[PDB]
Amino acid sequence: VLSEGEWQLVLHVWAKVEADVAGHGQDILIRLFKSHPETLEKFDRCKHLKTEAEMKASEDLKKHGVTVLTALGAILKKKGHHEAELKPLAQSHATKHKIPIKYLEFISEAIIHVLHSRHPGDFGADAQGAMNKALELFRKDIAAKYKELGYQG
Numbered sequence: 001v002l003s004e005g006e007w008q009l010v011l012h013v014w015a016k017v018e019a020d021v022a023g024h025g026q027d028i029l030i031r032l033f034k035s036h037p038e039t040l041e042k043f044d045r046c047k048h049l050k051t052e053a054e055m056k057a058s059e060d061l062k063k064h065g066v067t068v069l070t071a072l073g074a075i076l077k078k079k080g081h082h083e084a085e086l087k088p089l090a091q092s093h094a095t096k097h098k099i100p101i102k103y104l105e106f107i108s109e110a111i112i113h114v115l116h117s118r119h120p121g122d123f124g125a126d127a128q129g130a131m132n133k134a135l136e137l138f139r140k141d142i143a144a145k146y147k148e149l150g151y152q153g
């Protein structure tokens with residue numbers, strides 16, 4: 001459980017993401033793929049890491065980054081009351097895409113990295129810790145739903 005104050009720190013920095021969801025999404029996915037290139041294998045080959053400029057020019061990558069951050073922002077605004085939003089995400093990510101929790105840890109790391117790089121004034125230790133707790137709760141709850149669907153990843 002997060003405190004109300006911790007939720008507020010989470011949603012305060014999230015409002016900065018909402019000013020430009022696509023740009024944040026691009027930086028987060030580029031960080032993910034550079035730091036953990038194996039995560040490209042969950043998409044069509046082109047399993048090969050392209051240059052940063054090719055990733056920034058990609059209409060498909062920019063769309064993916066907005067798909068992710070739209071869904072995650074709706075989850076964070078529920079302040080832990082997110083069973084109904086996690087249900088369809090667990091369904092697809094466990095049964096169709098097959099995304100292991102360790103890849104959700106990787107993308108959580110990439111989100112925290114970009115938020116710290118772009119908004120340090122809104123992302124000191126207390127806010128970083130609140131965002132860490134919020135993303136740990138997301139991963140814990142999605143993992144329990146994965147198991148309910150028979151996926152142990």
Ligand code: HEM
Pocket residue numbers: 039040042043067068069071072088089092093097099103104107
């Ligand atoms: C914060 C974490 C994430 C969120 C909120 C998220 C959200 C979404 C949403 C909303 C969709 C579209 C609807 C659907 O298929 O469920 C989607 C599709 C997808 N996601 Fe995720 N995702 C996350 C993490 C990841 C990660 C880490 C990977 C891979 C390493 C991944 C792989 C996919 C794939 C392969 C698709 C299908 C894309 C396509 O067919 O074009 N997701 N995701």
Ligand SMILES: */C(=C/C(=O)O)C(=O)Nc1cc2cccnc2c2ncccc12
Pocket residue numbers: 040043044045046060061064
């Ligand atoms: C590969 C690269 C290119 O520029 O031709 C390619 O099109 N394959 C591919 C990679 C990829 C990576 C991350 C997310 N989504 C994708 C793709 N999505 C749809 C079709 C192909 C994709």
Ligand SMILES: O=C(O)/C=C\C(=O)Nc1cc2cccnc2c2ncccc12
Pocket residue numbers: 045046047048049050051
């Ligand atoms: O565009 C597509 O049709 C498929 C994906 C893909 O990654 N192609 C590439 C394949 C490679 C193989 C070996 C080394 N480098 C690369 C490479 N380097 C940069 C950008 C793209 C690629």
